[PDB]
């Protein structure tokens, strides 16, 4: 497991594009005519449809775990699955706001069908947080980059370990 200092850097590192993560595009990559350029900073776990929301949170759960767990499906699919010990599936209800780092899952509405996922990188209050996701732009084609959100769509968060 990581402290939240391990993981607070870390978040810094994805918006930077300086993480230490063997699937950060180190020189501008394409190889999908449908997605623009993937600038460097960028993260593809899968070698598919270039720097997706899933990829980064590919990644998030592989440094968390080790390398133990790889998640599979799409954004949407990740609240049917578990990441096994100390990960917890939330119910986002109106009195739910949540902890930086973990991760926060959109299924309903104008996500319903793929879903869209990202990491909490500011709790925020009941109103709005500040997100650090990939691809909110459909191109598939910048690193991590932090959104204020206002909840929308937003149907559950993923608590995730921390190390004392
Ligand atoms: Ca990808
Ligand atoms: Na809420
Ligand atoms: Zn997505």
Same mark, same amino acid.
């Given at each position: 497991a990581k402290t939240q200092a391990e993981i607070n850097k870390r978040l810094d590192a994805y918006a930077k594009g300086?993480? *230490? @993560?063997? +699937?950060?595009?180190?020189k501008a990559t394409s190889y999908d005519? @449908?997605?623009?350029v993937m600038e460097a900073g960028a993260i593809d776990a *899968?070698? +598919? +449809?270039?720097?997706?929301?899933?990829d980064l949170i590919t990644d998030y759960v592989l440094w968390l775990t080790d390398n133990k767990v790889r998640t599979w499906g799409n954004?949407? *699919?990740?609240?049917?699955?578990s990441y096994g010990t100390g990960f917890k599936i939330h119910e986002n209800k109106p009195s739910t706001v949540p902890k930086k780092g973990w991760i926060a899952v959109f299924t309903s509405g @104008? #996500?319903?069908?793929?879903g869209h996922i990202g990491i909490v990188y500011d709790g925020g209050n009941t109103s709005t947080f500040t997100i650090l996701e990939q691809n909110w732009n459909g #191109?598939?084609?910048?690193?991590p980059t932090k959104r204020v959100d206002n909840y929308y769509g937003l149907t559950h968060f993923i608590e995730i370990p921390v190390k004392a």
């Open positions: 300086t993480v *230490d @993560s063997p +699937y950060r595009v180190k005519p @449908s997605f623009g *899968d070698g +598919y +449809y270039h720097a997706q929301c899933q954004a949407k *699919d990740q609240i049917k699955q @104008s #996500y319903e069908q793929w #191109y598939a084609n910048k690193k």
